[model samples]
Target: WLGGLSRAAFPKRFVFGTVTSAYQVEGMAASGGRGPSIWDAFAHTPGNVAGNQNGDVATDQYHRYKEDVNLMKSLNFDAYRFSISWSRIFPDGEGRVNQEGVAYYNNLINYLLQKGITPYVNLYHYDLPLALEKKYGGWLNAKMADLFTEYADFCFKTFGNRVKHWFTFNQPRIVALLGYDQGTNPPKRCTKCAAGGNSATEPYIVAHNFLLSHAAAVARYRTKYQAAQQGKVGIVLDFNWYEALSNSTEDQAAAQRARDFHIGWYLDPLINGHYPQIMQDLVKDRLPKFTPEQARLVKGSADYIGINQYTASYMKGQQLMQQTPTSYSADWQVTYVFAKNGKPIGPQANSNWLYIVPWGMYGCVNYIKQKYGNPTVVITENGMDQPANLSRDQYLRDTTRVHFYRSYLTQLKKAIDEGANVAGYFAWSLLDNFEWLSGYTSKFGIVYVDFNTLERHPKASAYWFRDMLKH
Candidate 1:
């Protein structure tokens, strides 16, 4: 099923691990001197999330991390990728440090090291401290760039000695688009949103500030901590491969437009010090400009790149019917086609957005290598979800997930063999926990979590990883 592939088939130092975010997995939201995050406020807002579910008591990982770490060790994972909650460390976003918050993560990090697992720490994962948002509109304000840097600096000084792999932000595009444009996530703002925001401009502003914040933090780390700590710093991006709906130039251009708007929007500035030309032409003055100093800081900010990829969609050329209300989702001017020629792109997953397209993984990594000068790459998050209503026995026997990983990893190996500088792969999650919008209704974890009893049962995919890594 794996095409005779195994961990032994890859380079010796290529790492394999599992990924999780503090808000998604760690409960004790109000404990440990932690303040509310945007997610907390958004979840508490009625009708904001499906089933009105919130991460207030997600997985209880804040208390049960020891068990989770031991589970990773037992699975023979070489590393773990997890994010630090800013609100947990600084209850009000800034000012006094929460000693209890510091202690909690110190405990988690020390335990992982003691168990011989390397820690890949990500600084931000969409749970911005609510205080910041209420004070200055969060990512929409330029001041947030410095606040984020200060927070990142604190984390670097506190934990850099033990955490060698650092990602400044994870999927900042989602943070900007979903939060500001689609009004689907926290700080729910849009031109017509109940929360009230100008979707035409706010998404770009938030994304601009996000890029600046990332650059500022990376600058601080490089100047103040990187040489001493010997850690690598980067950012994570979620890339969905876009295949052309047809062989026509228009369809191909549409696919390219989708790519440029999605990954290129953030990545181009980091690598090239400017937004993509297509974006520049389309967005015009609405897109924020980087000052020379900011440009210098933003360009070449990353020491590596982390990609969280899952599915692929077909893109077909389309034009705006009329200028009503502009949105980032609408800016690409392309329709997402799931199938072509009376056939599906690949098998659909439980989630409407996810489709099994193993070749997309290869194309994604290769595109980064070929277009972005072959920077060191990590597949930070990848996996499919099952419906949450599945029985324990049904969830445990996750044959589809196992097949998904095998096929995707097989493509990843192909990319590495063909000279892509891919370095590591981390599954999307280690345990079933609170999924953002879908809440607990989506189970993406390899280990099933009985939300009622908080018990974890490793699925077939977990054993597959163990056996694959054993040799």
Candidate 2:
């Protein structure tokens, strides 16, 4: 119990589980009637991902989901949150249903239910069907959102009957920024990137579509499926807590700007029906606007808010320090300062970008509660990665990750106790699988998977979860 933590510590019916995306875990990318996603194209390119790696064979969860579900059940986990590949459902993006793809997810969903593991189905991860991007210029075009709603309609019809928990998209802000602005992710479009793009204009357009797409999907669920299917649908947004780098007013303002640019950029539209005022002023016409009807659709579209929160950053205004406007990230005019005074934020994780700041969990939730009117929030994705090169025993004895969970959950509990309307907590991953960009170098799962043999070994962290979650 860690003496003070257990299943009882959380509110009744609070879900405890882990999450995975299709491209990151599922193999059989080309077979099983699966069409390509932008990730398929991005990872295949030589210089984009580490080791020129791709998720072609991943951990082969496509064929091994039964074993995975059994692992979750054995660990006393309540749910398995996985994404359905849009391409898998509609191979050429949309038009024809792929029977094999439908059967694969149906097989996965039924097995989870059979094992008493609730399924949390996310409609899209970063894997946009390549055909969609090719045909309509991806999220850059307004029609992409229309096409997305049609796809969403198909999913709700097919799986909404059993999959009670649903998220329209996972980290769409990241998809917009990283994929379009920075060009680090799929459909790699940015200034001077291989796929020629404009960092200044494209990301906003994509984000606008992302919001409309989310609203459209949610509207469909509410209109057609909610009464019959009885499921909840939301969108997963990632937030990294930003603290003022200095006690100065400018730094605090900068921190606020970062928050507005980061989480509030989307949530403001969803909750208040417009982009943050800061974004409206700075981004100006670069940011898109919603019509009166679209505003109505955008506001309160989510049944809940799914948050993929990790780490914290110190913010300092970048307006004085620097470059001309570049993109969505630059428009914020803030520098993310990781360390202040003489100390780091917290211990660093295997991934260079991740810093362990358990208190940030409290800060993030409370911020949302205070700012966004205490809406339902789920800690959809939260876990630190370990170095993937560890020896087998070293990997299994994941004491660091165990402590990470304990400390993070301790703060999570503190937030909930203080009246944050939080419901579920899903770890970042179930097995060490194909992570995007960094590839397999960063292992963020409680269960260790031997990539060579595809064997799943429960680490110390997994046992910690079992102990806390058991009756």
TM-score of 1: 0.98
lDDT of 2 at 107: 91
Which candidate has the highest lDDT of all? 1
What are the per-residue Cα lDDT tens digits for candidate 2 across 297-375?
8999998999998989888874544446687777888887768897989989999889999999999999999999999
Off by over 4 Å in 1: 318-325
lDDT of each: 0.91, 0.90
Candidate 2, poorest ten consecutive residues by summed lDDT: 317-326
Clashes of 2: 0
lDDT of 1 by residue, 9-61 (tens): 99888899999999999998998799999999988989878899999889999
lDDT of 1: 0.91
- In model 1, the clashing pairs are none
Question: Distance (Å) between predicted and true CA of 368, model 2?
Answer: 0.1
Give TM per candidate: 0.98, 0.98
**What's the C-alpha lDDT at position 23 in model 1?**
95
The residue pairs in collision within model 2 are none
